Design a protein around this ligand. Structure first.
Ligand SMILES: [Mg+2]
Ligand SMILES: [Mg+2]
Ligand SMILES: [Mg+2]
Ligand SMILES: [Mg+2]
Ligand SMILES: [Mg+2]
Ligand SMILES: [Mg+2]
Ligand SMILES: [Mg+2]
Ligand SMILES: [Mg+2]
Ligand SMILES: [Mg+2]
Ligand SMILES: [Mg+2]
Ligand SMILES: [Mg+2]
Ligand SMILES: [Mg+2]
Ligand SMILES: [Mg+2]
Ligand SMILES: [Mg+2]
Ligand SMILES: [Zn+2]
Ligand SMILES: [Zn+2]
Ligand SMILES: [Zn+2]
Ligand SMILES: [Zn+2]
Lengths: 194, 198, 65, 95, 129, 64, 149
RNA sequence: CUCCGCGAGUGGUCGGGGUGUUUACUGGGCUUAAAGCGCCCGUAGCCGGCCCGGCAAGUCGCUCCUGAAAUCCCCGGGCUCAA
RNA sequence: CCCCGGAGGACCACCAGUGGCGAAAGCGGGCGGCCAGAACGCGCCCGACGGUGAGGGGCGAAAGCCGGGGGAGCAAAGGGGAUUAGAUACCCCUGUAGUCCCGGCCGUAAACGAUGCGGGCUAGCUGUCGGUCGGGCUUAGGGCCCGGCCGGUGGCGAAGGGAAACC
């Protein structure tokens, strides 16, 4: 891999060795290989695969729109979308913006029914929205589990969150927006003025 | 007070002439001096000179290659060339190609740590990529200029040729003195007249 | 007047003036924004004429209090 | 969907308009929403070489303003059907 | 018509803080506004509270520190008992360690933490976090 | 405020004039004081758009 | 109107925050009170009395100089109003409209203006009965109040 | 034919609750999806500026007399554990 | 068709505008009389007298109804000339209620900003109307231009909001 751009150079040269230094000084990742180098234990899951058609004179020109979430289960997650003509290409485009959109998530405790200082859950109440789905992530006591929906559990689990309570709104069957709204609520944790 | 350049030179280039519009932002900041009975806005020349020196201080702390000085206004094409050919910044007169700072797959994909624009209201595409790419911006604002994403501003007449030439000659000179190659009383090999465009 | 939630301590924009009648020579205190015909207290000629704003003065202004 | 924020007639802060009558028509509109093109007008066009400065022939030229509806205005080419981005661009109607 | 000054003052801070302003002027004002802002300043959500003297009641100019994520007045002023404050605590606050409520108890206005130590309830005023 | 709460993950560059966190994927800007060059000025993307002014803690310089 | 007005103006007088006696004032508190009684016996109302004091005699505010208010000052010297000045003004405004409505029965614009004025009367009667400034049995009879015109 | 779920049970139709922030106090919406009375005066109701003093009605804290037993939650014990 | 006269009813061209006024409906020639409601300027008066408002009331386009007057133009219904497969429509000629005034009734409308009323806070730029203050000029005018405040009326657009158009 050629380290274009310069942030790929320091990542390739070993001048940057941990992913936290990318996020602790506000360095915008522009190449997926920076994530591949710095998070070799990255897992990716296919959240959704919808077939979208565009009408034409001769008929609809189909495409695959795949949604992919990536994460290390240690407070790093990223969700990306890909549109292609073949399913294998669409997932690969999905994983690339998934990796480019990877973000840290602040974890901790804060439920009234818990006292552990572990990163098992979200620290405080957070909310994230995508289109019309509104998702609230509430801190939970340890051992409860993930109390979200199925697609929400994938994104929450990939971010290394163990226990959480949810309060959803809008049409959650729009899986691209439910998944994206769950991603945004995690990413909104860094907008909390501590 | 001691001006960087003698006061009859400044008032001959008309640097203290702004557009007849309103800018509630600039007036509260103090960069507006007085409005004439015909409605013309005049800047504070003391604040202009002070901001020129600090601009030279800011530019001198970056490598000369890494600073981008771009304008699309053709009256500033010659001054920005002569500004930096003496300082060696990546001068870019003409169309800022969209994607120059945000598309690394582009053949002209430059990497700069500072950006300098002449008029942000017309050089919007340059400032737009700076906001997205998180690069500091300096600009010669005036009454008509939108102040978005401008980390350092110099309220000066960025429309006239004489004002543009006299401002880039002063700024080109001062950055060398802070950089080192010129003495505190030394001057450039060329006067401001050769900076001006034609 | 401006909003009271914007100005810190609002003050009257008017002022009180001392006028000497051009005929007799009495000094009189009057409101700058007089809403009536101001007459010299001694001879009685018109000293100020009301308008929609500042009053028009027929007498000389000694000093604005 | 509400096409045009203007509602199609620059009426203003009022309730009712006095309205006019359409030449070549009568479908018409209120005082706003009615096209009012003005043309220079003059009888006997370019005969001024053989008239006017020939005999005495004091000729006259009367500014005439014409009022039309949307049907007639589109019919006579005074009004086109602009694109959505071009709807907000203020151009004079060739006098 | 202006009805409740505390909700008006608390929404002004929310509006001015969201614009990243250094300070905010407040008018009109009562003692309840002052005693609430003292509790806020005691918890580091608010800088210095200068006072101005006009004929129209007075003003406060409060220096904001970017310490507020959300703020607002609870309406109506609900009575609360001491054993109930835990329930109202989780209604308006995120996390067990973050944020406070402002209660107006018979001993004076205090945070909900200082009410729990005193073992008294009262009338709810506002929430901050 | 915050009482005995442990928040994990990196701490981003807090805005020097607002405490607004330079969030991931929203690029702030960091530099030194234009007059001194001593202190470091952190401007979140929100402050750059709104034109929120900054002040040097060491010298009296204030920006846009 | 009272509701749904097109314009909501801000016109008012900005008095000093804590008004004190003017140093230029050439009038003792007894002179200021006696001036008001002469205007009152002349027939000016308490609103117009204050304008004459300020405009003619240069007295800014009778309250800081005297420590009393204009109606309280006039009340002490035997000047007693039939009704409060605001209420009497609204009643006179209704009679001048109801006189107009006799010869112009179809003045619908004036009728609504009468209804606004005649509702402003009813609000003030509700207030004044509660504070006791008017007798509790007072009734707005337009025919029974014709002398107030 | 084979496999799946539960199993002395497992199904069908009803009714209630959840479903459902489709009754919204927590906690919905009303330009265009259903949804602002054509407009206004106003009674009851609800909601109401600031400061000072009094009462203590609401409100808050403690305690007492009570709010049958059963039912409910926690703890101990006895039926072999369990019920 | 042209000229000299008379009568009659309706309307108020250009100026003239996302101009003005009004709660909505609505209001466009001039002079006058009687009223109403606002905006601005104010060290004027009272001292919370306020908001919303179920039920209750009042006003409320056009058409239409009741009784009287009037009747130029237009014109439902109807009559005729055409067109058409048909044409009880679209066009043409004609035509009666109606349209206009007065007294009353009706009480509806895409009665619309499809946006209830009251109050506070939240970047700005720009056109224009009313008042006022400061500066510069003066068709020496109640006039014009620049700037500030208050109040309206349009456009673009922060933050924010929205399913989106968009606000
Ligand atoms: Mg302008
Ligand atoms: Mg209408
Ligand atoms: Mg009442
Ligand atoms: Mg609904
Ligand atoms: Mg309505
Ligand atoms: Mg209805
Ligand atoms: Mg009412
Ligand atoms: Mg009690
Ligand atoms: Mg009703
Ligand atoms: Mg009708
Ligand atoms: Mg006919
Ligand atoms: Mg007829
Ligand atoms: Mg409606
Ligand atoms: Mg909506
Ligand atoms: Zn825990
Ligand atoms: Zn005299
Ligand atoms: Zn037509
Ligand atoms: Zn400094």
């Amino acid at each position: 891999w050629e380290p274009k751009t310069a942030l790929g150079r320091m990542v390739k040269e070993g001048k940057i060795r941990t992913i936290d230094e990318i996020f602790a000084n506000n360095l915008l990742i522009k190449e997926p290989e920076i994530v591949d180098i710095l998070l070799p234990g990255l897992k990716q899951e296919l959240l959704n695969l919808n077939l979208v058609q565009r009408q034409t004179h001769a008929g609809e020109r189909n495409q695959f729109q795949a949604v992919v979430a990536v994460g290390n289960e240690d407070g790093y997650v990223g969700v990306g979308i890909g549109k292609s003509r073949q399913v294998r290409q669409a997932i690969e485009k999905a994983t690339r913006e998934a990796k480019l959109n990877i973000t840290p998530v602040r974890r901790g405790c804060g439920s009234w029914k818990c006292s552990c200082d572990e990163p098992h859950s979200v620290p405080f109440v957070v909310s994230g929205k995508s289109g019309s789905v509104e998702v609230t992530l509430i801190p939970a006591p340890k051992g409860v589990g993930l109390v979200a929906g199925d697609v929400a559990k994938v994104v929450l689990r990939l971010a290394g969150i163990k226990d959480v309570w949810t309060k959803t709104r809008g049409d959650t069957r729009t899986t691209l927006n439910f998944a994206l709204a769950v991603f945004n609520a995690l990413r909104n944790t860094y907008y909390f003025k501590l | 007070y001691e001006y960087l350049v003698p006061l009859e030179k400044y008032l001959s280039a008309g640097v203290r002439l702004g557009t007849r519009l309103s800018n509630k932002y600039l007036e509260e900041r103090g960069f507006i001096y007085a409005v004439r009975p015909d409605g013309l806005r005049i800047f504070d020349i003391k604040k202009i000179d002070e901001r020129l020196r600090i601009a030279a201080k800011l530019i001198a702390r970056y490598p000369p290659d890494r600073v981008l000085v771009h304008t699309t206004r053709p009256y500033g094409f010659k001054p920005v060339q002569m500004f930096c050919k003496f300082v060696g910044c990546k001068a870019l007169t003409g169309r800022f190609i969209p994607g120059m700072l945000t598309n690394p797959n582009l053949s002209n994909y430059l990497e700069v740590d500072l950006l300098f624009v002449v008029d942000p209201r017309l050089d919007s595409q340059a400032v737009a990529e700076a906001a997205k790419m998180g690069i500091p911006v300096v600009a010669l604002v005036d009454t008509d200029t939108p102040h978005q994403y401008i980390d350092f501003m110099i309220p000066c007449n960025n429309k006239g040729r004489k004002s543009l030439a006299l401002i880039f000659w002063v700024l080109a000179r001062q950055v060398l003195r802070e950089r080192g190659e010129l003495k505190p009383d030394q001057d450039l090999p060329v006067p401001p007249e050769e900076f001006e465009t034609r | 007047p401006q909003r009271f939630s914007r100005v810190l301590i609002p003050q009257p924009r008017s002022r009180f003036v001392r006028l000497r009648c051009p005929d007799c020579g009495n000094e009189q205190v009057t409101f700058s924004h007089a809403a009536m015909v101001v007459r010299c207290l001694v001879c009685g000629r018109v000293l100020a004429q009301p308008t929609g704003g500042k009053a028009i003065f027929a007498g000389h202004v000694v000093k604005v209090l | 969907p509400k096409k045009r924020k203007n509602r199609g007639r620059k009426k203003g802060d009022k309730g009712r308009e006095p309205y006019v009558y359409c030449d070549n028509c009568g479908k018409v509109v209120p005082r706003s929403k009615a096209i009012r093109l003005t043309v220079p007008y003059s009888p006997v066009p370019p005969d001024l070489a053989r008239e006017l400065e020939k005999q005495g022939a004091i000729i006259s030229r009367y500014l005439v303003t014409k009022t039309y509806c949307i049907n007639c205005a589109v019919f006579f080419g005074i009004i086109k059907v602009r694109p959505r981005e071009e709807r907000k661009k203020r151009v004079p109607l060739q006098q | 018509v202006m009805l409740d000054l505390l909700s008006n003052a608390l929404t002004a801070i929310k509006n001015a803080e969201a614009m990243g302003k250094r300070q905010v002027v407040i008018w009109p004002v009562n003692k309840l506004i002052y005693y609430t802002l003292r509790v806020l300043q005691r918890y580091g959500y608010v800088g210095e509270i200068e006072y101005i003297d006009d004929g129209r009641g007075g003003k406060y100019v409060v220096q904001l520190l970017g310490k507020i994520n959300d703020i607002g007045a609870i309406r109506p002023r609900f009575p609360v008992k001491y054993r109930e404050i835990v329930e109202w605590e989780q209604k308006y606050l995120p996390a067990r360690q973050i944020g406070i409520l402002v209660i107006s108890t018979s001993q004076g206005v205090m945070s909900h933490l200082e009410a729990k130590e005193k073992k008294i309830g009262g009338v709810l005023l506002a929430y901050v976090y | 405020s915050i009482r005995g709460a442990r928040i994990y993950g990196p701490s981003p560059p807090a805005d020097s004039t607002t405490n607004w966190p330079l969030a991931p994927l929203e690029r702030g800007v960091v530099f030194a004081c234009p007059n001194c060059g001593k202190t470091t000025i952190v401007r979140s993307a929100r402050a750059r758009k709104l034109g929120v002014p900054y002040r040097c803690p060491e010298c009296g310089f204030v920006g846009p | 109107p009272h509701r749904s007005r097109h314009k909501k103006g801000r016109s008012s007088s900005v008095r000093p925050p804590h008004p004190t006696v003017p140093t230029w004032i050439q009038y003792t508190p007894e002179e200021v009170e006696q001036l008001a009684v002469e205007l009152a016996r002349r027939g000016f109302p308490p609103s117009q009395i204050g304008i004459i004091l300020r405009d003619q005699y240069g007295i800014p505010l009778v309250k800081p100089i005297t420590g009393k208010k204009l109606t309280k000052i006039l009340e002490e010297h035997g000047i007693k109003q039939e009704l409060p000045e605001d209420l009497l003004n609204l009643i006179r405004r209704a009679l001048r409209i109801r006189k107009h409505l006799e010869e112009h029965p179809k003045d619908m614009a004036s009728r609504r203006g009468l209804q606004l004025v005649e509702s402003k009367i009813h609000r003030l009667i509700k207030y004044y009965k509660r504070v006791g400034k008017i007798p509790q049995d007072f009734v707005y009879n337009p025919e029974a109040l014709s002398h107030l015109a």
